[PDB]
């Protein structure tokens, strides 16, 4: 069937949206060529309907059968509660969409009846009818880049498709429990979202060094979202109700799967019918959990189908990485034409063929890829970093607008031992919150695609559990990862280090005055800074953080919220 139908009405915005980068002294001290900073809007929204539509033919055989057997074996072991109301509601982000019933997200935190008594219906509806298509609301994303032009063109807006708020908060009650536990229990080790930044790194270092000769590979399906297929989705509900659930989580369960998340129609921003969808929902709770599931069962089982060696994979929803034993060069090679052969049969074809890799650092997943450096002991430390482009970009834009739910401190945190963080993004925010007093100010980021309410003062904290104390004295980084730095900050015209030194020197002097939590931010974050170094040692409070209920992947919806 086709991932989607269009009626030929537009995808059209709900408000105004900005493309370009406003005057702002504040933006242009990071980077003056504010020409190549833009953001996407609905008017490039049908370039993207073109690429995400076409017919799924998908095969199904053997291999996928006893993969499958396994996962629902696995399933069984799992006992997940039904969240009350109460609790649902509590983790609606505060900028999470309002409902077209009259009440929006601040009703829903701050259980006001109107609220409360709407969920409520709509919960018992989802018990009483099972099969009724539940409307959903199709939206392009506007999302910060900078112009590349030897790709040629512009990047065109992503899409979202999401529910009404109120069947948001009921999917939270049936499912929240269901998402946040059975990913672990169902692909152990694989389940790649469960690890934290640093947690990760030394696993897949731990995993590639294990191996007697290695050979790894990125796969990335095309469009991902509109390859899930109807059954891939029934799969998913029949691996669901392998858990142990309440009657009623298993009736809402099951009306969810029917109604919302196997397809149903687009409606645009004026109330228009744009289309319908037979594929996978970008804004519904188990978008992240369902594409694991779904990308680890077909990635297991093309594992077989292709004989590739002692498979270890590392699924996070679209995203998958193989590591394996290599069998040589030739045979490396037929084996990923084998594995990608089969992954398209299980409708998950490519967008660029995966290509074998016998160098852990040239592996590119999640944007992401493993570099090296060394810490105030002289130890070696593997790190993830990426291309800083995009995240600098986004920095400037939030600098000069206004943004809600932020990507800068998100990228501090899941950056924080990287070269550009450290240099650029550290020194600019902490410079810009000291001089506003807004150090204690709490503000919406999001990892791993859900939201987070942090207080910039207690990132050193933040990134001493995730990454280490080595985070905050690297040095003698690759010169790969200079080099990426170095052609970005030429790019896009930012400052060069003996600026950002005597800003990080200024920061650091004003934060230690002020003691505390500010102290510790100029002790530990730009200790590099100073010729005079101060000894950094575990920051006690740091064990003080509640991060049990950290890393639950929001993908593509972000509307799971936690305060820290
Ligand atoms: C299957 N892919 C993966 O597991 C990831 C790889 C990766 C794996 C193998 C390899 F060879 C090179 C890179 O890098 C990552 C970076 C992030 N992060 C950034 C998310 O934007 S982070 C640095 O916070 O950990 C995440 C976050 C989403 C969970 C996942 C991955
Ligand atoms: C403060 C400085 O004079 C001293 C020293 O601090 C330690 C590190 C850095 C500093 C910035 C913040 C993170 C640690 N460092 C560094 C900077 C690099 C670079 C660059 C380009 C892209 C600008 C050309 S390469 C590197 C390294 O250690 O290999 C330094 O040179």
């Given at each position: 069937?086709?991932?989607?139908?269009?009626?030929?009405?537009?995808?059209?915005?709900?408000?105004?949206?900005?493309?370009?980068?406003?005057?702002?002294?504040?933006?242009?001290?990071?980077?003056?060529?504010?020409?190549?900073?833009?953001?996407?809007?609905?008017?490039?929204?049908?370039?993207?309907?073109?690429?995400?539509?076409?017919?799924?033919?998908?095969?199904?055989?053997?291999?996928?059968?006893?993969?499958?057997?396994?996962?629902?074996?696995?399933?069984?072991?799992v006992?997940?509660?039904?969240?009350?109301?109460?609790?649902?509601?509590?983790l609606?982000?505060?900028?999470?969409?309002?409902?077209?019933?009259?009440?929006?997200?601040?009703?829903?935190?701050?259980?006001?009846?109107?609220?409360?008594?709407?969920?409520?219906?709509?919960?018992?509806?989802?018990?009483?009818?099972?099969?009724?298509?539940?409307?959903?609301?199709?939206?392009?994303?506007?999302?910060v880049?900078?112009?590349?032009?030897?790709?040629?063109?512009?990047?065109?807006?992503?899409?979202?498709?999401?529910?009404?708020?109120?069947?948001?908060?009921?999917?939270?009650?049936?499912?929240?429990?269901?998402?946040?536990?059975?990913?672990?229990?169902?692909?152990?080790?694989?389940y790649?979202?469960?690890?934290?930044?640093?947690?990760?790194?030394?696993?897949?270092?731990?995993?590639?060094?294990?191996?007697?000769?290695?050979?790894?590979?990125?796969?990335?399906?095309?469009?991902?979202?509109?390859?899930?297929?109807?059954?891939?989705?029934?799969?998913?509900?029949?691996?669901?109700?392998?858990?142990?659930?309440?009657?009623?989580?298993?009736?809402?369960?099951?009306?969810?799967?029917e109604?919302?998340?196997?397809?149903?129609?687009?409606?645009?921003?004026?109330?228009?019918?744009?289309g319908?969808?037979?594929?996978?929902?970008?804004?519904?709770?188990?978008?992240?959990?369902?594409?694991?599931?779904?990308?680890?069962?077909?990635?297991?089982?093309?594992?077989?189908?292709?004989?590739?060696?002692?498979?270890?994979?590392?699924?996070?929803?679209?995203?998958?990485?193989?590591?394996?034993?290599?069998?040589?060069?030739?045979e490396?090679?037929?084996?990923?034409?084998?594995?990608?052969?089969?992954?398209?049969?299980?409708?998950?074809?490519?967008?660029?063929?995966?290509?074998?890799?016998?160098?852990?650092?040239?592996?590119?997943?999640?944007?992401?890829?493993?570099?090296?450096?060394?810490?105030?002991?002289?130890?070696?430390?593997?790190?993830?970093?990426?291309?800083?482009?995009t995240?600098?970009?986004?920095?400037?834009?939030?600098?000069?607008?206004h943004?809600?739910?932020?990507?800068?401190?998100?990228?501090?945190?899941?950056?924080?031992?990287?070269?550009?963080?450290?240099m650029?993004?550290?020194?600019?925010?902490?410079?810009?919150?000291?001089?506003?007093?807004?150090?204690?100010?709490?503000?919406?980021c999001?990892?791993?695609?859900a939201?987070?309410?942090?207080?910039?003062?207690?990132?050193?904290?933040?990134?001493?559990?995730?990454?280490?104390?080595?985070?905050?004295?690297?040095?003698?980084?690759?010169?790969?990862?200079?080099?990426?730095?170095?052609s970005?900050?030429?790019?896009?015209?930012?400052?060069?280090l003996?600026?950002?030194?005597?800003?990080?020197?200024?920061?650091?002097?004003?934060?230690?005055?002020?003691?505390?939590?500010?102290?510790?931010?100029?002790?530990?974050?730009?200790?590099?800074?100073?010729?005079?170094?101060?000894?950094?040692?575990?920051?006690?409070?740091?064990?003080?953080?509640?991060?049990?209920?950290?890393?639950?992947?929001?993908?593509?919806?972000?509307?799971?919220?936690?305060?820290?």
């Amino acid at each position: 069937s086709m991932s989607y139908t269009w009626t030929g009405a537009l995808i059209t915005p709900c408000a105004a949206e900005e493309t370009k980068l406003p005057i702002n002294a504040l933006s242009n001290s990071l980077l003056r060529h504010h020409n190549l900073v833009y953001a996407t809007t609905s008017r490039s929204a049908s370039l993207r309907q073109k690429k995400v539509t076409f017919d799924r033919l998908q095969v199904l055989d053997d291999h996928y059968r006893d993969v499958l057997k396994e996962m629902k074996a696995k399933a069984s072991t799992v006992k997940a509660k039904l969240l009350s109301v109460e609790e649902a509601c509590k983790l609606t982000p505060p900028h999470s969409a309002r409902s077209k019933f009259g009440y929006g997200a601040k009703d829903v935190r701050n259980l006001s009846s109107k609220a409360v008594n709407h969920i409520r219906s709509v919960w018992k509806d989802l018990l009483e009818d099972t099969e009724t298509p539940i409307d959903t609301t199709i939206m392009a994303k506007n999302e910060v880049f900078c112009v590349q032009p030897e790709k040629g063109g512009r990047k065109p807006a992503r899409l979202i498709v999401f529910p009404d708020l109120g069947v948001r908060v009921c999917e939270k009650m049936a499912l929240y429990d269901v998402v946040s536990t059975l990913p672990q229990a169902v692909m152990g080790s694989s389940y790649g979202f469960q690890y934290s930044p640093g947690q990760r790194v030394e696993f897949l270092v731990n995993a590639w060094k294990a191996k007697k000769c290695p050979m790894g590979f990125a796969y990335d399906t095309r469009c991902f979202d509109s390859t899930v297929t109807e059954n891939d989705i029934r799969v998913e509900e029949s691996i669901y109700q392998c858990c142990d659930l309440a009657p009623e989580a298993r009736q809402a369960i099951r009306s969810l799967t029917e109604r919302l998340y196997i397809g149903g129609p687009l409606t645009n921003s004026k109330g228009q019918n744009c289309g319908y969808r037979r594929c996978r929902a970008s804004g519904v709770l188990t978008t992240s959990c369902g594409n694991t599931l779904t990308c680890y069962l077909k990635a297991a089982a093309a594992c077989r189908a292709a004989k590739l060696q002692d498979c270890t994979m590392l699924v996070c929803g679209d995203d998958l990485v193989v590591i394996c034993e290599s069998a040589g060069t030739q045979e490396d090679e037929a084996s990923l034409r084998a594995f990608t052969e089969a992954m398209t049969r299980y409708s998950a074809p490519p967008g660029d063929p995966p290509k074998p890799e016998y160098d852990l650092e040239l592996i590119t997943s999640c944007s992401s890829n493993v570099s090296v450096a060394h810490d105030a002991s002289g130890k070696r430390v593997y790190y993830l970093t990426r291309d800083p482009t995009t995240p600098l970009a986004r920095a400037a834009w939030e600098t000069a607008r206004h943004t809600p739910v932020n990507s800068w401190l998100g990228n501090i945190i899941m950056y924080a031992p990287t070269l550009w963080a450290r240099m650029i993004l550290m020194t600019h925010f902490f410079s810009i919150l000291l001089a506003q007093e807004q150090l204690e100010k709490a503000l919406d980021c999001q990892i791993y695609g859900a939201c987070y309410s942090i207080e910039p003062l207690d990132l050193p904290q933040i990134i001493q559990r995730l990454h280490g104390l080595s985070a905050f004295s690297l040095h003698s980084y690759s010169p790969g990862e200079i080099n990426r730095v170095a052609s970005c900050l030429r790019k896009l015209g930012v400052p060069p280090l003996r600026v950002w030194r005597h800003r990080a020197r200024s920061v650091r002097a004003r934060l230690l005055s002020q003691g505390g939590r500010a102290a510790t931010c100029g002790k530990y974050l730009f200790n590099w800074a100073v010729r005079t170094k101060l000894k950094l040692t575990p920051i006690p409070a740091a064990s003080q953080l509640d991060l049990s209920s950290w890393f639950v992947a929001g993908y593509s919806g972000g509307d799971i919220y936690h305060s820290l």
